[PDB]
Design a protein around this ligand. Structure first.
Ligand SMILES: Nc1ncnc2c1ncn2[C@@H]1O[C@H](COP(=O)(O)OP(=O)(O)O)[C@@H](O)[C@H]1O
Ligand SMILES: Nc1ncnc2c1ncn2[C@@H]1O[C@H](COP(=O)(O)OP(=O)(O)O)[C@@H](O)[C@H]1O
Lengths: 55, 54, 374, 131, 50, 50, 374, 187
């Protein structure tokens, strides 16, 4: 049956219901939970009061 | 940097952290250097060894 | 009759397909599962069945412990391999295996004892007169119809790429990423725990796999789709369990196959499939990269997620220099491409010399395959 | 083989001997320097490697040199409390624009010789002492 | 409290025995290597003098 | 009973630490001697080959 | 005396070595690896550390992504190199960088920008009084103790041969080949998959590098070695992974270093190291070839494999006319030889007129290194 | 244990009797080091039996059911589950990690929770893990005597740290970002 068909690229076994729906991605990493923040470089977190106490 | 720490900094500049004694030969002069010396130095050393063997 | 049709058997981690040489489609397609009963029979005189092979095991899922003989493209258990091969030859095909040649497919990089064991089993047990072993992603080019291109074949076991330029394949540019569809199934099982649906047993992994095949797609832009999923509930689907329960898949539909492009979700530090394709391109020479950019070919069932071709095209377009055009060729029958090109390999007149004869095996042991094949 | 044995001989003799000799002399010098500043709070250390593991000696030395009181040490005798105290000291060192690298809390706690010596050397060299 | 004190002392003692056990075999090995170099002396010296 | 056992086990901990330190000193001395002997072997090897 | 020892820093592809001028041996030797964490940190209270440098990265390599700042003799990540130099100066030697001069090495042929950047960082960020950039093969010839000879140096990233006759170097015969120990490690990974062992991540790269260091050698005759390995299992060794598993290296002990002599295994067109040395010799003049044959000097850690000198001598003797001496001079401490040359270069009385002062740098920018360095 | 105590004729059905069965399990269950040998010993002699007193004065005898209930932790096929035992789960969780960090993980196994208070659980766990693990590695099972409250005790440690005052989900943060804030802060 191959020997009759010119192009197996354009070949259908089933309707398949195709196409029903409707700069690359940079690498990402999992978040860390052992230190609070790094928004201020060279900041001392031990000076700061706790967050809930600030009202 | 005050005054006491400057002595520490000056002492750290030598290869060992202490200044060397002057009577000891340098490590280039001692036999610990593994690079081969010149050929005629080895020739004179062999001549001296043969003279000592006699 | 003189020349007789040689049968081809495509074995992968997910499904086994088999059929004759000239046919456009495989004779039979069935999962590569071996099942055994966990419980004890209570009624006297139904009949004995020690093992369940193929679709019979898939019918009686909730009573057996399903087992896969192939792990990451390597045959872990061999007695199961004679079970599937006997069921293929004597039940699905109804042909005598000793009167035909056999074509088999395998992954590019794999232990050599695998090849030796398949050769020894095909010759000593089934008494096959001749056999051949071929690389799957090479056969994808025969199915595609071009002699110049790069193939990325992603099955249930492995994901491997190979470039071929004008019939010459470069072995130093072959890469074999170990990410596949079974890892995505496990990731889907792990992320369905978040919504409260628990899937644990081996018989329930098939349900998870069916959910994956039915309600998953590859997002074009991941973070924007995250924003849309967090905004409204338009992109939600409902799945019907076999016992009548209804689950709501919701956000997770485009979070399962995204692990293909960012393997850091699964804890692997390896690059994604697009970067693997790009690195396999740049490992080749300067003059053949232009032709390889225009003939990227997708293959394997794992690349049947909707929208994967556009995502790959966008990512490679971002990586490649801007002056060239990139077209991803994804045929609608890629799932059987590994089979289809293999059938073309059995119809050529010059292929009759390449068969490993029985006499050659008898005089050289099972190591003849390392000289004759590839 | 024999050439590899000679290379192992050369490295194990010369590299290790020179490194240990210099490191011993610098350890003695650093201990003698730090004891002078630690004497004012009537604290004395015998071995530099082991008495900096707990972290109270380090925070008291920074207390002497800075002139500003630091946050109080955490009340504990565990591993994590030592990590807390060493992290407080290193955060104070980062606070005064002194640049330190490859220097985590577990390095000081576990007692690495080279990193402790480097920390003392950076304290001696870069830190600003006011009277 | 006294129970945990006993436990800590016992663990430290066991570590001490392990370290001593390693030290003894290293000592034997170094002594044997020195003896082997000592035999190599005279054969090399004989070849040199001849 | 526990207070009685504490001092006993601490005594073997003491003795084990002491001869562990002694064995370490002996081992490092043996290592230094072995290295010096082996370089002494290289010197006479160079004799013979020249 | 007011004479201060200048620091000698050998920065290679694999490891970094450092010491004082006039010493017999470097004080500090440590791998040039920068690592970063790749998992979630949940134990709040422990100290946070952004980057691991040197042996600290190697001890905790199980949770890091290891990156080399220098690859193929060219430094790419400048901040990582700054961290390496800064850790060398402050933690491994404990010296003030603004007091002593420094001496640096590099490959012969490289991008022109590196030297300039290597100047600009060293004068500005570290405020050294003076610096000088030398070429590693010349320092190897210094360490050999002979004025004339041909130096072949292969590190972790680059291989290069230079001829020098009576102190006059011939720049048109300097040959650079991009084959080194990193590619041999990668080829060892690629051939270890045949036995069934999988090594993917960077920690596995370090493990494979250790395996290559311990259990590899160069065969004197390749075909006879392969025939002997096929004939019996006498040529087999066992290695223990840090997990506790046991692998059997077998045939692959001598196939990895054989890629140094036949680069067709790696897909490279270029010739082997022996033909590289022979072509570098024949590119010189007629009258100095006889002295270059008698004074071949090996260097670098990659030349540390057992059986390398005999194979090199046999191959060059086969290539050369059968009249002249072929003597391969390989000191036992060859891995550090380049650094030893630096210690001799900074101790000469005439070298004190060769330093690049800060005043000249302020006057003429970073381009002074092209005029003042070979 | 209820389903296996049905085998001796004793009947427990209500929710109040489940507390009685739980008390019996806590008092009279232990993990046998070897299972088939223990079955042979319990079948051969009656020295393994123990007597319990019900709240209404009845006296029952457990006997062979003392160690069969905890053995279900290692063989889940007794409950019809096809999952693996706890030793297999621990070994599989070790094996999923990287190669380098396995050696430290083999020597630092920690037990916790009340269910691990069966007498003899530590020896059985160490024996099974040593059987699974390679021989050149050594296995240490850490079972503190007060492990039932360990999940509390570490928590009492964690709230006393200095940096944990920077970890709290404040009232203002919840008011600003709703109840979904807990995923951003808590692990
Ligand atoms: N319609 C589909 N959509 C998405 N994924 C699919 C679909 N069909 C199959 N798959 C995935 O592909 C796998 C089958 O791939 P296949 O080409 O049969 O692998 P192989 O032939 O190498 O065994 C299945 O495990 C499944 O996860
Ligand atoms: N004893 C040895 N045997 C075999 N190979 C070695 C040995 N020592 C080092 N190597 C190889 O040499 C490389 C290090 O090269 P090196 O001399 O450090 O280059 P550079 O000094 O320019 O960085 C390592 O990657 C390793 O593969």
């Amino acid at each position: 049956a191959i020997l009759d068909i010119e192009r197996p690229d354009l070949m259908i076994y089933e309707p398949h219901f195709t196409y029903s729906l409707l700069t690359g991605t940079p690498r990402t990493s999992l978040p860390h939970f052992h230190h609070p923040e790094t928004t201020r470089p060279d900041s001392n977190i031990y000076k700061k009061p706790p967050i809930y106490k600030q009202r | 940097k005050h005054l006491i720490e400057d002595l520490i900094i000056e002492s750290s500049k030598f290869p060992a952290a202490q200044p060397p004694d002057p009577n000891q030969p340098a490590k280039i002069e001692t036999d610990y250097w593994p690079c081969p010396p010149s050929l005629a130095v080895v020739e004179t050393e062999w001549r001296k060894r043969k003279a000592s063997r006699r | 009759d003189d020349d007789i049709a040689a049968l081809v058997v495509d074995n992968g981690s997910g499904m086994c397909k088999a059929g004759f040489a000239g046919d456009d489609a495989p004779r039979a397609v069935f999962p590569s599962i071996v099942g055994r009963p966990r419980h004890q029979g209570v009624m006297v005189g139904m009949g004995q069945k020690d093992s369940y092979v193929g679709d019979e095991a898939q019918s009686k899922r909730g009573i057996l412990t399903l087992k896969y003989p192939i792990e990451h493209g390597i045959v872990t258990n061999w007695d199961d391999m004679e079970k599937i091969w006997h069921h293929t030859f004597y039940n699905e095909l109804r042909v005598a295996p000793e009167e035909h040649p056999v074509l088999l497919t395998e992954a590019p990089l794999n232990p050599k004892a695998n090849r030796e064991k398949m050769t020894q089993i095909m010759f000593e047990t089934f008494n096959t007169p001749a056999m051949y072993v071929a690389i799957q992603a090479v056969l994808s080019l025969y199915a595609s119809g071009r002699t110049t291109g790069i193939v990325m074949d992603s099955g249930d076991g492995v994901t491997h790429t190979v470039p071929i330029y004008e019939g010459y394949a470069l072995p130093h540019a072959i890469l074999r990423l170990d990410l596949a569809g079974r890892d995505l199934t496990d990731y889907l099982m792990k992320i369905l725990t978040e919504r409260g649906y628990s899937f644990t047993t081996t018989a329930e992994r098939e349900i998870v796999r069916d959910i994956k095949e039915k309600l998953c797609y590859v997002a074009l832009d991941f973070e924007q789709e995250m924003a849309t999923a967090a905004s409204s509930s338009s992109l939600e689907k409902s799945y019907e369990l076999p016992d009548g329960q209804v689950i709501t898949i919701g956000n997770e539909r485009f979070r399962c196959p995204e692990a293909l492009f960012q393997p850091s979700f699964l804890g692997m530090e390896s690059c994604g499939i697009h970067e693997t394709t790009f690195n396999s391109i740049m490992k080749c020479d300067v003059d053949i990269r232009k032709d390889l950019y225009a003939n990227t070919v997708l293959s394997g069932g794992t690349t049947m997620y909707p929208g994967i071709a556009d995502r790959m095209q966008k990512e490679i377009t971002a990586l490649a220099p801007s002056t060239m055009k990139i077209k991803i060729i994804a045929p609608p029958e890629r799932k059987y491409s590994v089979w289809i090109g293999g059938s073309i390999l059995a119809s050529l007149s010059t292929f009759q010399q390449m068969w490993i004869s029985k006499q050659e095996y008898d005089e050289s042991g099972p190591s003849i395959v390392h000289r004759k094949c590839f | 083989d024999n050439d590899n044995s000679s290379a192992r001989l050369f490295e194990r003799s010369r590299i290790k001997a020179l490194a240990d000799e210099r490191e011993v002399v610098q350890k003695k010098t650093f201990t003698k320097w730090v004891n002078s500043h630690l004497a004012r709070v009537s604290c004395r250390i015998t071995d530099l490697y082991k008495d900096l593991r707990d972290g109270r000696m380090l925070i008291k030395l920074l207390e002497v040199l800075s002139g500003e009181m630091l946050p109080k040490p955490t009340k504990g005798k565990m591993r994590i409390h030592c990590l807390e105290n060493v992290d407080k000291a290193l955060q104070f060192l980062k606070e005064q624009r002194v640049h330190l690298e490859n220097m985590g809390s577990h390095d000081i706690v576990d007692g690495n010789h080279r990193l402790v010596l480097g920390l003392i050397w950076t304290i001696i060299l870069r830190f600003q002492i006011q009277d | 409290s006294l129970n945990r004190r006993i436990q800590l002392v016992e663990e430290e003692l066991d570590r001490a025995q392990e370290r001593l056990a390693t030290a003894l075999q290293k000592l034997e090995e170094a002594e044997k290597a020195a003896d082997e170099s000592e035999r190599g002396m005279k054969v090399i010296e004989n070849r040199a003098l001849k | 009973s526990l207070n009685r056992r504490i001092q006993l086990v601490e005594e073997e901990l003491d003795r084990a630490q002491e001869r562990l330190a002694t064995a370490l000193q002996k081992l490092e001395e043996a290592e230094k001697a072995a290295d010096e002997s082996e370089r002494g072997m290289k010197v006479i090897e160079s004799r013979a080959q020249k």
